[PDB]
Each structure stands twice: as C-alpha cells, then as structure tokens.
Structure 1
Amino acid sequence: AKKLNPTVGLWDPLGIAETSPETIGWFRHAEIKHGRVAMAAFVGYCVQSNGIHFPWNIQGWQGTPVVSFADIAAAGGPADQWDALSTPAKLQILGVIGFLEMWSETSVVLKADGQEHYVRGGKPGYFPKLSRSDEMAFPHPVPLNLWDPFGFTSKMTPERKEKALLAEVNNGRLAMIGIFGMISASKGLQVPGLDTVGIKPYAGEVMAPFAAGDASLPFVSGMLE
C-alpha cells in the first residue's frame, strides 16, 4: 500500500523508508501489531473505566487468600487495578502472551500454513492457524482459533482483503494515538481532559511490580518522566 490517504502520501520524516526489504517488513509488522494491541488496550481500558467487573472468583481464584475479582476491579482504570493482581496471575498472563507471540513467530508453522519469511516478515500480521497436522500433536486439539474463531470471515475477495488491511492499519494508527492520549489523560496533560480518568500507575509504561527475584528495584521514582 503506497498511500491509503490521498492527501498525505509517503510521510517519512526520519527517512526510514527506501531501506532493506527486511527492515521495511519489520516496520510494517510492528505498526500492524502495535495498532492491534493498542486498539485492544483502548477497548479494555474503556471497559475497565466504565466498570465491567466479572461476577467470578467462586473458590480457587484467590489461592487460599481472600481476593475477589471485583476487589481487583475496585481500584481504578488500568492503574492499581492492573497493578494489584497477584504475581502468578501477571506472570502467567505474560507467559500466555509470549507463547502466542512465539507461535506467531515460528517459521515452521508459517511455512506449513503457506506464509512467508518469519520474524513477521513477508505477509506481515499473519497469525498461523493452531490446528490440523504437524502442530500441537500432543492432545490439545484447539477447537477454537486465534483469527476468525467463529468463521466470521470464511469468504473474502483479495481486493476486499487488501482494503480491510488498509482500514485496519489506519484504524490501528488512530487507536495507537488514542491510547497514548488516553494514558496521557490518565497522567494529565493534553487538551482539557475531564471525565475523571482516575490516576496513573507509575508513568504510562507501568509494569508488573511487587514481585520477587528481580523486582527489588526502587529506581522507578525519577529519570525525569
């Protein structure tokens, strides 16, 4: 896609374009993945700020302690709400996300599925299907999938697929801008924000603190920011 927007064109202020094809593919895949993750994060942050606390945690969720899901939800938006989960929960969520990312980055599964060069290179944004042959052979048949789990996109034209990909790229860029602005509005700044938007945990790029082994770092208080 040379230019989805006709009034913008090829905007390369830093000269990142006109480079090696691997770098261009990596940049395109990074843009697509960041846009998708930012759209999901914006939707989740809006749902958490509105209040969508799950009626759950009936035994086995806390782990012998008393920690309900609504108790975790009753702390803010992305804030102490996201920073108040247990260390095993955050560790296992990050591990599941890493397993999904490593499965997406696997070149054997991509070559079996008909994709192109890995590290999200040729055909960027393509997640391989986790089913069928020469994949997940030991039990775990995965009745659901990652993309189109209900078969909502069984048939689509290649021109329609390209138009939807361009729309996804533009919407992901807009959602990345909106998510950065929403994190800023949680921290303040910006235009007139209002709408409460709680307080901010750490500074924007908050992590999973209150752990053990490598989390004894009081260094997150300065470094400007």
Structure 2
Amino acid sequence: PWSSSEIKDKAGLEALAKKLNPTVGLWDPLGIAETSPETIGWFRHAEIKHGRVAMAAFVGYCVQSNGIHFPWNIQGWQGTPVVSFADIAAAGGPADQWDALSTPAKLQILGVIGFLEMWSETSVVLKADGQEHYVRGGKPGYFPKLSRSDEMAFPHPVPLNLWDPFGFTSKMTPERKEKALLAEVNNGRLAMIGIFGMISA
C-alpha cells in the first residue's frame, strides 16, 4: 500500500499537468492515467529517465558534431593498440563515433550506466536515504547518494555523488526545487523530440 503524497490518481496527474503547463493540461488519449498507483509511478519515472537520457544525448550530439574531441588516448597503455579521441572524432558523426569505439569500452560504459541504474532501483539504499522505490510511493527520479558512511556504503570510500557533487543546488528554496522539476520535465520532453529529430535527420 502507498504511504506518500506521490501522484496515484488521474486527479494528481491533472494537477501536475496544469503545473507543468497550464495550456495543454492532461493530454492522455491512451488513458494510461486510468491505472494503478504503481503503474502511475512507473510511467512518471520512465518519463523522467527518458528526459535525463534525451538531454544528455542531445548535448553530447551537439558537442560531437561541433567536434570538440578529447585530448587523450583512449587505448594503448596495457600493451594494446593505440587509438585517440581524435581518431574517434574523425570516424564520423555521433553514431559513427560510437561504432568506432572499441567493444570493451562500450561494455564498460554500459556497465557503469547499469551500475547507476541499480543504485537507483535498490530500495534498501533509498530507505537508508530518505526515499522508497518509485512504484511503492517513491519520488520519481531520485538518485541515492554514492558517497556515504552508513552500513550501505561501498567497501572503499567514494568521493562524490552523481547528482549535486558540489551543491550547485545548494539550498534551492523548498518549492523552487519543484519548479526546477517542472522545468526539467518540459526540457526533457523538448530534448526527447529534438534528439529523435536529429537521429531521423
């Protein structure tokens, strides 16, 4: 059973809809607001995560198309062939650059991404922190801290966290955080349509 103020009904979805945009309101033709609280939370977090990934992908696409490559060597230290980020850039456009990336580099990147995914999904970590799983009444999008000294801390200390490593939010006001969440949802949708547009082009 849900025990939080997280949205669990079409009324709350409509409230958040007018909050993010008074004009559109709730645009739900498929009627996936007519679902259980757990599914509503799942859809909320899915939207948020697509926003994160789409924004990151769009900014990466812009930087890679501009051609601001890295100055290092990507391989060739532990007795392997030498490949440079300049070579990766000269491979082609962003999809071609990803294709030109070596296979274990891809595997390690995807592994770190999955590590962050599971640190998000781990209910015990959120409850050691101040949250629960987004399906069972948790805030959609909260990343638990990777730096900690609790029993749920890594064997070796981690320096910083994923979100807010140096407190750029610092103390944003108790509701301007929600304002930024609204702006984030809108910008995530915009970046979603944008990145699919660039990929289609």
Task: State the TM-score bracket (shorter-chain normalisation).
Answer: 0.7 to 0.9
Distance 1:15 1:169, change over 3 A: same
Aligned to 1:89: 105
- The alpha carbon displacement at 1:131 in A equals 1.9
Residue by residue, what CA displacement relative to the aligned partner does 1:125-160 show, whole Å, maximum 9, x if unpaired?
Answer: 000011223356454311121111111112122211
Distance in 1, matches of 2:136 and 2:195, equals 23
The Cα offsets for residues 61-115 of structure 1, whole Å up to 9 and x where unpaired, read as 5852132221111122212211011111001110110011001111010001110
Aligned counterpart, 2:62: 46
Deviation of 1:122 (Å): 1.7
* SS of the residue 1:173 aligns to: helix
- Cα–Cα, structure 1 residues 85 and 63, in superposed 2: closer, same or farther, change >3 Å? farther
1:176 Cα deviation (Å)? 0.3
Percent identical: 100
Aligned residues between the structures: 185
Q: Does the Cα contact within 8 Å between 1:105 and 1:120 map onto a contact in 2?
A: no
Cα distance in 1, alignment partners of residues 90 and 21 from structure 2: 42
Aligned partner of 1:106 in structure 2 is: 122
8 Å CA contact 2:88–2:101 kept in 1: the answer is: yes
- Per-residue CA deviation, residues 162-198 of structure 1 (Å, 9 max, x unaligned), is 111011001100110101111111xxxxxxxxxxxxx
Deviation of 1:38 (Å)? 0.3
Answer yes or no: is the 8 Å Cα contact 2:69–2:85 preserved in 1. yes
Contact 1:110 1:118 in 2 (8 A): no
**Unaligned runs of at least 5 residues, structure 2:** 1-16
Distance (Å, rounded) in 1 between the aligned partners of 2:68 and 2:122: 35
Deviation of 1:3 (Å): 3.9
Answer yes or no: is the 8 Å Cα contact 2:76–2:83 preserved in 1: no
Separation of aligned partners in 2, 1:138 and 1:3? 39
Computed over aligned residues only, the root mean square deviation of the Cα atoms, in angstroms, reads 2.0
Cα pair distance change 1:64/1:117, threshold 3 Å: closer
TM-score of the two chains, using structure 1 as the length reference: 0.76
Q: How does 1:128-139 map to 2 (within 5 A)?
A: 128-134=144-150, 137-139=153-155
Task: Provide closer, same or farther for how the CA distance between residues 59 and 14 of structure 1 changes in structure 2, counting only shifts above 3 A.
Answer: closer
Cα distance in 2 for partners of 1:176, 1:61 equals: 38
1:152 pairs with 168, 175, 184, which one? 168
Higher helix share: 2
TM-score using structure 2 length: 0.85
In the alignment, the residues of structure 2 paired with residue 88 and residue 165 of structure 1 have an alpha-carbon distance, to the nearest angstrom, of 35
Does the C-alpha gap of structure 1 residues 5 and 139 become closer, same or farther in structure 2, counting only changes over 3 Å?
Answer: same
Residue 79 of structure 2: aligned partner:
63
